[PDB]
């Protein structure tokens, strides 16, 4: 099936645009983890590296470009434009303890030992744990003034449609990617803790 992967990707893009648009119009990035956004920018950079090499479609190059431009712009707004509202004192997760184990795991556990496959496995593993700095920040302060309800919905719709995609392709096509699925389950459980913390701590 390709209806679920398409609407899932579009729902992920919607979340990125919503967060980016929220920061610009409120002139604040209060409650946002710049470390998580940096990791997500690193996911898209490593996954879509063949931007600047193979051309397949105008939707293909632009979608790769849209994700990159939006993630980098969010990073630019948090650490440069609106750095005064960046709660650096609360975003303290040491991301080297994510990237280094993720890098080592990608060289150890993958489907094929090749540069393009290792790079893809890196971006799959990293994305599954990229939200961790955001979780520890909300768990720390109980606030996420910039996180909107609709932002979390599109993040959740992205995970639900991908879950459906795994099930449809397995039952109807016999396809299953154990690495992508296992990493995808870790990511979805982590997003659910994101949603559980937001409801219990921020939504007081």
């Amino acid at each position, epitope marked *: 099936m*390709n209806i679920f992967r398409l609407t899932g990707d579009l729902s992920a893009l919607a979340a990125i645009i919503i967060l980016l648009l929220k920061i610009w119009k409120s002139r604040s990035c209060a409650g946002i983890s710049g470390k998580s956004q940096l990791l997500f920018a690193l996911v898209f950079t490593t996954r*879509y590296l063949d931007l600047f090499t193979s051309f*397949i479609s105008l939707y293909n190059t632009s*979608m790769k470009l849209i994700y990159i431009a939006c993630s980098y712009a969010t990073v630019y707004l948090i650490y440069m434009k609106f750095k005064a509202t960046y709660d650096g004192n609360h975003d303290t997760f040491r991301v080297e303890f994510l990237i280094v184990p993720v890098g080592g795991l990608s060289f150890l556990v993958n489907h094929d030992f090749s540069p393009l496959e290792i790079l893809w496995t890196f971006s799959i593993y990293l994305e599954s744990v990229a939200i961790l700095p955001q979780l520890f920040m909300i768990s720390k302060t109980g606030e996420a003034e910039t996180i909107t309800t609709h932002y979390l919905f599109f993040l959740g719709l992205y995970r639900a449609l991908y879950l459906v995609n795994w099930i449809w392709r397995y039952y109807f096509e016999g396809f299953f990617d154990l690495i992508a699925v296992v990493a995808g389950v870790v990511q979805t459980v982590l997003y659910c803790d994101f949603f559980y913390l937001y409801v219990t701590k921020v939504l007081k």
Partner: nanobody
Amino acid sequence: QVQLVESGGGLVQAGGSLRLSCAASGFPVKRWSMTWYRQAPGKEREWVAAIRSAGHWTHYADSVKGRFTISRDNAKNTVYLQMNSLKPEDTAVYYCNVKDEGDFSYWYDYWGQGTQVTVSA
């Protein structure tokens, strides 16, 4: 943009073996998957065996485990389906389907014309 051609079908006795081939032509992508389907007369098409562009991963339907073997050959743009110990229930038109596994490649989805496989009891 991409053409798939299946061959190797025909008539064979029960307990025989056959090897189908799906030759791919056109513009390649870095990461793909290839799946064999078959459609017996009057029934729905069902997937049979699956393989990726690299790695040791293979998958076989419950009804063909131990009897079918799927294998690759990128130097020729061809994927094989080895069929041993054939039963009359394997009679169908077999199709191969190649999909792009890269991101944002939703419409890169190609099917062969089909090759007839008949197994006499």
